[PDB]
């Protein structure tokens, strides 16, 4: 079916419609229905799901739960074009696909289609969870570069968030933590980019596997403290102290993967995507006809 | 050898849903992704919600800057239409309608139109305003179109802001979006690549005759082709049982798949592999030549 | 369940993980053995990997338990005969 976005997803799960889910999982639903004792012969179960009564949707949510599926975009070129997700059921008729994963599939949303495949046997469910799961493919096999790099909206939300301007609301005030930085942004007393001394507590792990806390006052902005609320423990503050374009957020996720491993990098990739979408929505970053500024010197050059 | 032909015409009414394809007239495609409620829409300081929220980031890379000029000129057209609706809903006499429609039809440089309403005789002007109240249509020929200053002067005739950008509030939080955003009217088309014509699913359907594999297509209730590059992409992982059931149990081997169906409806979750029957077809086609292919041991 | 990283930290091959967890899930599903960790109505695959993460199951312990519970069956048969 045709794909669509659904940005509420965690990156190990994808949205899958109820009609496709009841068609692809007919034998598991038959086995579940025969186990409970609701029906007797197989025919009765096929009439039940042909009618789609009120009790087979609970059966369907109990066959989905921990059963991965293989999503596949139709021109598969490398191995990151078949990835295994966990379904989340969708009122609708379109596969909801987590956005970061799109940069692996070369999948935009201009009319694309993807195929779902079901691992039937038990070794195949374990291969989908342990080799082909989308959390397991965060580095491209051609090199060392991360393939779950945040693509387009989220880097605009970050670049508007962690930046600065020479005067805003709350210029040069002092803040006792990142929590009241977000509280000053939400209440309407400061701006998202307004330079400010905060007190942040960065955890540097300089010992042999022991995280040592160092707390200090960084001359930073409001947005850099709000984005510091999402960074895991081990990374230093200077990973967010700059302006965070796309190369900088890619090496942010890369340094998180090299230091803190896989699980903080998966949960931190999701928190990056969520905060990028949220502050890009709050940014209101349009495009106008006045934004393309003609040089005044252009006509004399011609 | 046919007795009678009965033809029946069903008439479906397909509305809209997440998954259809809409597009403007400049290449801005898109799968509609969420059909929001009315309240969540960004509204402005008049009260009206916006209908569709596009994405700005498609403009500087995909260089179709014409859609933003079309958006601003559409907002100018609807501003003139709203002023006609205001001057007509208050039951005003035809003199003020004649004044305003004449000012909205002159408005430019040396142009081709040059109309005058002094030869419409007080009844056509009311019916012309009955047709203009949902907006005023504007022609813009291809390479001799409306420049920027004419769009600005027409946005000044309505009481809209000059830059085309209204500040917009939020529907969820109820608090203002910073840095005022671009609204207007774009003329968007629904394309007939719908989503309840592409969506398909198959547990177990019919099987082909010469090679015991599932049929192809949607009208024939068929399964999706697990092609060659996907086989390469599963060799590229270490997924070995997934590929074995992906090309022996789920696809070809008939005794294997009936054993599989009994094992799935009994909770077992186990495959008895066997051989693809299409490999036996390969043996019969190579063997039907003078070639003697076998299976040793 | 999201990641299987520690299940590879305790079985370093990442392919032997699939064999050990498949053997364990086949013992729990059809053979009717109790899980050694209390579940939360998870499926048998996640309970297998959840036993791998505790460390109380790998291929060594599975061979030990299959040899001892095969010797127990044959010992019960021999003491029933003689």
């Amino acid at each position: 079916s045709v794909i669509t976005v659904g940005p509420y997803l965690r990156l190990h799960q994808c949205g899958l419609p109820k009609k496709m889910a009841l068609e692809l999982f007919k034998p598991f639903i038959y086995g579940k229905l025969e186990l409970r004792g609701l029906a007797t012969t197989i025919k009765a179960a096929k009439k039940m799901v042909e009618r789609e009564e009120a009790v087979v949707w609970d059966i369907l949510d109990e066959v989905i739960r921990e059963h991965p599926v293989l999503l596949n975009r139709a021109p598969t070129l490398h191995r990151l074009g078949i990835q295994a997700f966990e379904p989340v059921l969708i009122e609708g008729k379109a596969i909801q696909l987590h956005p970061l994963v799109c940069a692996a599939y070369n999948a935009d949303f201009d009319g694309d289609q993807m195929a779902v495949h079901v691992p039937l046997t038990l070794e195949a469910q374990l291969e989908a969870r342990a080799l082909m799961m989308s959390t397991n493919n965060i580095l491209s096999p051609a090199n060392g570069e991360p393939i779950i790099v945040p693509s387009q909206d989220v880097v605009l939300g970050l670049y508007y968030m962690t930046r600065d301007c020479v005067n805003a609301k709350g210029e040069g005030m002092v803040l006792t933590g990142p929590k009241e930085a977000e509280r000053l942004y939400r209440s309407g007393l400061a701006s998202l980019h307004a330079r400010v001394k905060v007190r942040i507590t960065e955890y540097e792990k300089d010992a042999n596997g022991e995280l040592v806390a160092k707390t200090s006052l960084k001359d930073t902005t409001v947005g850099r403290a709000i984005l510091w609320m999402i960074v895991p423990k081990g990374l230093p503050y200077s990973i967010v102290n700059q302006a965070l374009g796309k190369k900088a957020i890619s090496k942010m996720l890369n340094t998180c993967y090299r230091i803190l491993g896989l699980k903080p990098t998966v949960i931190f990739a999701d928190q990056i995507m969520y905060t990028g979408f949220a502050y890009a929505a709050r940014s209101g970053a349009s495009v106008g006809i006045d934004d393309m500024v003609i040089p005044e010197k252009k006509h004399e050059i011609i | 050898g046919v007795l009678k032909i009965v033809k029946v015409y069903l008439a479906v009414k397909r509305r809209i849903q997440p998954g259809d394809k809409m597009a403007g007239r400049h290449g801005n495609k898109g799968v509609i992704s969420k059909i929001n409620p009315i309240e969540d829409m960004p509204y402005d300081e008049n009260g009206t919600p916006v209908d569709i929220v596009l994405n700005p980031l498609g403009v500087p890379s995909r260089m179709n800057i014409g859609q933003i000029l079309e958006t601003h000129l559409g907002m100018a057209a609807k501003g003139i239409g709203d002023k006609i609706n205001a001057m007509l809903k208050q039951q005003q006499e035809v003199a003020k309608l004649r004044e305003f429609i004449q000012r909205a039809y002159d408005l430019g440089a040396d142009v081709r139109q040059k109309v005058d309403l002094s030869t419409f005789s007080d009844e056509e002007v009311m019916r012309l305003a009955e047709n203009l109240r949902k907006g005023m249509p504007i022609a813009t020929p291809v390479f001799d179109g409306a420049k920027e200053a004419e769009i600005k002067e027409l946005l000044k005739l309505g009481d809209l802001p000059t830059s085309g950008q209204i500040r917009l509030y939020d529907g969820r939080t109820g608090e203002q979006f910073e840095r005022p955003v671009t609204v207007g009217y774009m003329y968007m088309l629904k394309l007939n690549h719908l989503v309840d014509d592409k969506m398909h699913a198959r547990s177990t359907g019919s099987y082909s005759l010469v090679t015991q594999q599932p049929l192809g297509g949607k009208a024939q209730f068929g399964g999706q082709r697990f092609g060659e590059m996907e086989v390469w992409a599963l060799e590229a992982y270490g997924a070995a049982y997934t590929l074995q059931e992906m090309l022996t149990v789920k696809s070809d081997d008939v005794n294997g798949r009936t054993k599989m169906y009994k094992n799935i409806v009994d909770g077992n979750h186990q495959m008895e592999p066997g051989m693809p029957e299409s490999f036996n077809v390969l043996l019969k086609e190579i063997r039907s030549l003078g070639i003697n292919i076998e299976l040793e041991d | 369940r999201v990641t299987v990283q520690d299940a590879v930290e305790k079985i370093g091959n990442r392919f032997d993980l699939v064999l050990v967890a498949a053997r364990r899930a086949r013992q729990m599903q059809v053979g009717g053995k109790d899980p050694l960790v209390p579940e939360e109505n998870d499926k048998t695959t996640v309970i297998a990997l959840r036993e791998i993460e505790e460390g109380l199951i790998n291929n060594q312990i599975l061979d030990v338990r299959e040899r001892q519970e095969q010797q127990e069956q044959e010992a019960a048969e021999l003491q029933a005969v003689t």
Partner: peptide, 16 residues
């Protein structure tokens, strides 16, 4: 004989 099946092919190549 590469992925998960390399143990199976080790077993089959050992048992000849």
């Amino acid at each position: 004989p590469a992925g998960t099946g390399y143990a199976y092919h080790q077993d089959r190549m050992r048992r000849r």
